[PDB]
Design a protein around this ligand. Structure first.
Ligand SMILES: Nc1ncnc2c1ncn2[C@@H]1O[C@H](COP(=O)(O)OP(=O)(O)O)[C@@H](O)[C@H]1O
Ligand SMILES: Nc1ncnc2c1ncn2[C@@H]1O[C@H](COP(=O)(O)OP(=O)(O)O)[C@@H](O)[C@H]1O
Ligand SMILES: Nc1ncnc2c1ncn2[C@@H]1O[C@H](COP(=O)(O)OP(=O)(O)O)[C@@H](O)[C@H]1O
Ligand SMILES: [Mg+2]
Lengths: 397, 392, 83
DNA sequence: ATATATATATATATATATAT
DNA sequence: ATATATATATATATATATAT
C-alpha cells in the first residue's frame, strides 16, 4: 500500500539547454583567463549538467593543480560567475575538472530522482535519494551500510530540505515492518509536519527531558536486539531477517529466547544537534556515542543534521564513528574540514548543493540535493496517516 | 495614526560630490594603487550617503587578495579612516573598493519612513533601520526575523538605533495589532516611553520586576499557542482571520483580535546579571514558539561578551545586527564573519538576514530625542495607556 | 572580573608588567609600553583609541599641606550608621 | 616564480586550580 | 573525592611575507 509517486510535483525545469557554440566560446574564454594567470590549459571535454558544467581541462606540462585551486576565486571573479569549483582529481581520467555554474539554474525536483532505476530496484529497507549528480545521473545511497550521517552547512543552504528528501526516501520505499523512525527536533520548524505517520515511535521530540529517554530506549533496544540475535546464531540484522523469512518459508515461527517476525530498521534523526547539546549536554553525549559505536549490526541508524560541527558540539568519539558526511555550504576551508576532512565545501552554491562523501573514500561526490517544498511533505504525510494509525510506544519515554 | 508631518523634514543638501571630484578621486585611487604593486583601472563610480563605492577593473593577473591586503595602506595613502574591499560584486568582473566620504550626510528618519516600502509593508512590526550603501532604504519585517540581536561597543548609535526601531514599530500600528513591554535596566534609555497605549505595564525598570514580565510573556505565548489549536490555526494572523471575518459574516466565535506583543529588551546584560539564570534560560524558552503567537524580542546589549550573548540565547535568534564594536573578538560573538569592528561608527551596522550569510552594509537612521518626545506625546494624545496587574 | 569591566567604561592603566594585564584592563594591549613613573594611557568614557596622558606628580609633603588647609576650615563629620 | 619563515585556527593530551 | 575550566605543548592545515 505504498503511496503513489504521483503525489510529487512533476518534472518541469527540463527546458534548459545550451548550444555548443556557447560552450566553445566559454571554453576559449576559460583558457584565456587562465593563461592570463600564468597557468595555461587546454579544455578537453565540456561535460554539461543541470546546475554546473564541468569544463574538463587538461593542464600543461609542469603546472601543478594547486596553481589552479589557489585562484579558484580570481578565475570566478574574472568569468562573471559566482564561484567555480576545481575538481582537482577526476577518478579514472587524467584531467582537472573546473565546474563553472550555469546562468539559469535548472532546478531538481524529487519525482525526477525517485523515478530512476537505481531507486526502483534498490533492495535496502532504508535508501536515500540524495539527488542528481553533476550530469543528471541520479545519486541514490543506502543508509543501512552508510551507516550514519552528518548534515552540515551554514544557514540557508538546504539542510532541512536535505533531511526532508532523506525522510521521503525512507517513506516511499519502506513499510512500518521494514523501517521505523525516531525524530528529535529542537527549534521545531520543519520536522513537526511528519507527526502522525505509522513509522514513528514518539511525538516530534521537543521535550528535551524526553529526548534523553528516547535515546536511552534506543540504546536499550540495541542491547535487546543484540541479545536476541546472538541467541539465534546470526551476525547482523540482515542475516536475522534472512533466518526469520526462511522460517516463515517452512511455516514455522521460531522461538523467542513463542513467535518472532521480521524486525524494523530504526532511524534516529536529530536536527540541529548544537541546540540539543546546548540543553542536554553531557547527559546525552555518551548516549549518542554509544548508539553510534555499536549500532550498525542491529539497525539503529543515526542521522545528525547540524550547523558547523566542531568538537565543541559533536565530540571526536562520535565523529570518529560517523564516516559518511555531507556538506551543503561551509564558509571557509576550516568549516569545510570540520565536516568533511577536506576543502572545497566552501566552493559551492546554496539552495541544496551538497558534497556527498561515501564511506571510506577521499573524493566527495558532488550531488545536487533534490528540492522538496513543504506542500510535497504535507501531501505525503497526510496520505500516510490515511494508511496507518499513529502507533506510538510510550514505554520509550 | 501620528502622521508623517511630525518628524524633522530632511534638510536639503545640494550634494557632497561633483563629477570632477569623483573623476579626481578615481584618478587618485588608480595612481595610489599604481604606486603599490597592483595595476588598476576604475570604470564606474557609485556614490552614497556615507560610503562611496569604486568598482575597479584589475589588470590581467591581478589577484584580489593583493588589493584586499593593500586595503589598509590605501586607507593611509588616501587620507581616510579605512576602506573595505568588496572582493566580488555579483554578475560583474570588477572588484569594489568602498571609500568613506569627507562630508558625511545624516540618514534622517523621515527620509526612511517616507520611502515607498514602509508605506506598502504588509506587517505590523517593520524595523525601518535606514539606508544602505546605494542610498536605498533597508526595511525588514520583525515577524519574519523573528527576533533580534542588536549589539555594539558603547557610542555606536545603538540607543538611537533601537529608538528608531521602536519608532518604526510604533508609527504604523495601533494597540489592537502591536503592543510593547519594555525593559530598560540602566535607568538611561527608553525611560521616555511612559504614556503610550502600546505598553502593557509601567516600563519594567526594576530588574527583579523583569522576571515577572518575562514569565507573563512565556505564559502568554504558551496560552496563545493552545488557543491556536483550539481553532486549528497556526499563526496569529490565522487566529485573526476568524475574528476579522467574524465581522464580515457576523460570527459569535468566542473563547474555547489578539495583538502582536514585542518585548522590547534593551541592554540585557544588566537584566542577566541582576537576575541570573531564570532570565538566561527564559528567552531561549520564549523564542521557540513566540514566532507564531505575536511575541517578539529586540534583544540589545552594549557589551557583546561570551557570557552575555550565550549559545543558549544566541542560537534561538539568527537575526543579528552589529555596530562599531571593539575588535574581532566581539565581532565573532555578535556576528560570524570578519569586519564588524572596522565600521565608520555613528550608526553604521552590518544587518545579517535570517536565511543568509552575507551581512548587508547598512547606514542607521538618526532620530532626535526631541522628535522622540514629540511622537511619544502624540501617541499619548491620540489615545490613553492601559496596563495589566499580574505583570508585576 | 566581568562584573568590574561590565559597567566601568572609563579605565586608567599605568605601566603593567605584561600584555595579558594590558588586555585585562583596556582590551587593547598598549599599556605595557609605558615609561613608568606616573605614565598612563587614558581610555576615555565611551570607547575609542586610548589617549596617552602623562600623569602629574604630587608629593606627600603637599597632600599633607592641603589636608591641613582643609582641616583648619572644617571637622570630621562621620555619619554613625555608615559603618 | 618558487622554496622557506612567521603568524593563526582546530583538535588532542596533560597539569593545575576551582567548584559540587 | 569527583567533574569542569584554563593554560600549554604539539601536531596538522592555511595564508602572507621574505630569500634565491
Ligand atoms: N534542492 C533545492 N533547490 C533549490 N532551492 C533549495 C533546495 N533545497 C533548499 N533550497 C532553498 O533553501 C532554503 C532552505 O534552507 P534550510 O535547509 O532551511 O537552511 P537552514 O536550515 O540552514 O536555514 C529554502 O528557502 C529553499 O528555497
Ligand atoms: N545615524 C547617525 N547620524 C548622526 N549621528 C549619530 C548616528 N548614530 C549615532 N549618532 C551619534 O552617536 C550617539 C549615539 O551613541 P550610542 O551608540 O547610543 O551610545 P551607547 O552605545 O553608549 O548607547 C548619538 O548621540 C549621535 O550623536
Ligand atoms: N609625574 C611624575 N613624574 C615622574 N615620576 C613620578 C610622577 N608621578 C609619580 N612619579 C613616581 O612615582 C613614585 C611613587 O609611586 P608609588 O606610590 O610607589 O606607587 P605604588 O604606591 O602604586 O606602588 C615616586 O617615586 C615618583 O618618582
Ligand atoms: Mg533549517
Amino acid at each position: 500500500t505504498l503511496p503513489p509517486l504521483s503525489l510529487l510535483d512533476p518534472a518541469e525545469v527540463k527546458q534548459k539547454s545550451y548550444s555548443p557554440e556557447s560552450l566553445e566560446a566559454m571554453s576559449r574564454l576559460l583558457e584565456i583567463k587562465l593563461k592570463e594567470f600564468g597557468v595555461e590549459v587546454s579544455v578537453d571535454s565540456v561535460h554539461p549538467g543541470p546546475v554546473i558544467t564541468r569544463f574538463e581541462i587538461q593542464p600543461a606540462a609542469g603546472v601543478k593543480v594547486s596553481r589552479i585551486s589557489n585562484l579558484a576565486k580570481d578565475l570566478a571573479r574574472s568569468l562573471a560567475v559566482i564561484s567555480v569549483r576545481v575538481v582537482e582529481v577526476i577518478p579514472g581520467k587524467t584531467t582537472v575538472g573546473i565546474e563553472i555554474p550555469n546562468e539559469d539554474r535548472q532546478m531538481v525536483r524529487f519525482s525526477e530522482v525517485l523515478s530512476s532505476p537505481e531507486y526502483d530496484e534498490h533492495k535496502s529497507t532504508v535508501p536515500l535519494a540524495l539527488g542528481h549528480d553533476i550530469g543528471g545521473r541520479p545519486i541514490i545511497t543506502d543508509l543501512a551500510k552508510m551507516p550514519h550521517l552528518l548534515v552540515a552547512g551554514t544557514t540557508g543552504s538546504g539542510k532541512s530540505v536535505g533531511v526532508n528528501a532523506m525522510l521521503l526516501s525512507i517513506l516511499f520505499k519502506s513499510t512500518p515492518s521494514e523501517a521505523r523512525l525516531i525524530m528529535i527536533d529542537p527549534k521545531m520548524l520543519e520536522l513537526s509536519i511528519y507527526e502522525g505517520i505509522p513509522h514513528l515511535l514518539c511525538p516530534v521530540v521537543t521535550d528535551m527531558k524526553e529526548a534523553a529517554n528516547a535515546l536511552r530506549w534506543s540504546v536499550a533496544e540495541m542491547e535487546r536486539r543484540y541479545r536476541l540475535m546472538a541467541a539465534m546464531g546470526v551476525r547482523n540484522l540482515a542475516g536475522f531477517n534472512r533466518k526469520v523469512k526462511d522460517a516463515e518459508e517452512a511455516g514455522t515461527p521460531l522461538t523467542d529466547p513463542p513467535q518472532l517476525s521480521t524486525l524494523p530498521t530504526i532511524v534516529v534523526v536529530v536536527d540541529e544537534f548544537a541546540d540539543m547539546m546546548m540543553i542536554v549536554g553531557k547527559k546525552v553525549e555518551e548516549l549518542i556515542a554509544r548508539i553510534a559505536q555499536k549500532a550498525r549490526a542491529a539497525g539503529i541508524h543515526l542521522i545528525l543534521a547540524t550547523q558547523r560541527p566542531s568538537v565543541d558540539v559533536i565530540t571526536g568519539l562520535i565523529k570518529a564513528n560517523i564516516p559518511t558526511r555531507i556538506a551543503f555550504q561551509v564558509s571557509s576551508k576550516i568549516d569545510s574540514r570540520t565536516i568533511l576532512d577536506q576543502g572545497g565545501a566552501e566552493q559551492l552554491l546554496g539552495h541544496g548543493d551538497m558534497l556527498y562523501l561515501p564511506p571510506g573514500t577521499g573524493l566527495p561526490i558532488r550531488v545536487h540535493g533534490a528540492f522538496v517544498s513543504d506542500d510535497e511533505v504535507h501531501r505525503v504525510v497526510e496520505a500516510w496517516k490515511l494508511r496507518g494509525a499513529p502507533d506510538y510506544i510510550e514505554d520509550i519515554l
